[PDB]
Every structure is written in structure tokens, then in C-alpha cells.
Amino acid sequence: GMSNKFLGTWKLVSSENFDDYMKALGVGLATRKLGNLAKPTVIISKKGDIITIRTESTFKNTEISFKLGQEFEETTADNRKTKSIVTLQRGSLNQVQRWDGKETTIKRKLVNGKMVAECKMKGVVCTRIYEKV
């Protein structure tokens, strides 16, 4: 299952190409400005086989709870209503979000103790790096 090393509180330390990723998602200008300024904390926890990923920032908080491989309803930080599935591939926690015939993926993996989130939409790729608090 998901490595226990994912469990805990993570702080954003680096964000590359987030503005173009937000553009690809249809996020408007004023929202992108705040999005690019945000330095969220991400908290990963687990109760039995239910995994929870909570994001906290001054601008927006989000939270998803899910079982691996089972599709669930999600509300994203930019207020999309998606149907999502989180899978595990070679240690990586891979989230796919589907809405209005569109799709984006967020793959989270551990690299030398950091958590790296790769966000992909229509050929645009954003990389966000988190450090364990």
C-alpha cells in the first residue's frame, strides 16, 4: 500500500510552471495571482484504508478522502467538481481528475525525503516540491 513515509505535514518549498498549469485548467487571472503567491501546507493521513489529503492555504483549503482505486467525488481548489481516482504505481500516488470531458493528473512521489507533485494538463507540466515539517 501507500508508504507510511507519505504520512504527515508537508510545506511547499518550490513551484515551477504553476501559472500555465492553472491557465490550462481555466483558472482566471485574479485567482492565478493568489494561487502563485500561495505556499500551502499539505497534510496526509490515514484511518484504516481511507487516505486523506488536506491542503491548507490562506486563499483556499481543500480535502479529499478516498480508498485506492475507487472513484470518488472531488471539489478542487478552483471549484471544479470532478470524479477522481487515486492509484499507486511504483510508489507514486497518482490522482486523476475528470470533469466536462477533460482530465488532469497529479502524481505525488517521494524523492530523497521530499514530496514532489507533478501536475499535468494538456501537455503542460507543473512541478511542486514539498518538505516534511
Contacting residues toward Cl ion, per CB under 5 A: 38-39, 57-58
Binding ligand PLM (rule: CB under 6 A), the pick from 17, 41, 45, 57 is 57
Sole window of 1-9, 44-52, 64-72, 76-84 interacting with ligand PLM (rule: CB under 6 A): 76-84
For residue 42, the partner it binds in Cl ion, ligand PLM, none, with Cβ less than 5 to 8 A by kind, is: ligand PLM
Q: What is the smallest separation between the CB atom of 38 and Cl ion, expressed in angstroms?
A: 4
Rounded to 5°, angle at Cα 68 from 64 and 71 = 65
86 binds ligand PLM (CB under 6 A): no
Q: Residue 21 annotated as binding?
A: no
3-state secondary structure of 101: coil
Taking the C-alpha atoms of residue 129 and residue 18, their distance in angstroms, rounded to an integer, is 12
Taking the C-alpha atoms of residue 17 and residue 117, their distance in angstroms, rounded to an integer, is 12
In order of 30, 48, 62, 65, 128, the CA distances from 117 in angstroms are 24, 24, 16, 18, 5
Measured from each CB, the residue nearest to ligand PLM is 35
For residue 82, the partner it binds in ligand PLM, Cl ion, none, with Cβ less than 5 to 8 A by kind, is: none
CA torsion 60→46→48→99, rounded to 10°?
40
Question: How many residues in total does the chain contain?
Answer: 133
Q: What is the smallest separation between the CB atom of 6 and Cl ion, expressed in angstroms?
A: 21
Annotated binding-site residue numbers for (9Z)-octadecenoate: 108, 128-130
Give residues in contact with ligand PLM (CB under 6 A): 22, 27, 31, 35, 38, 40, 42, 55, 57, 59-60, 76-78, 106, 117, 119, 128
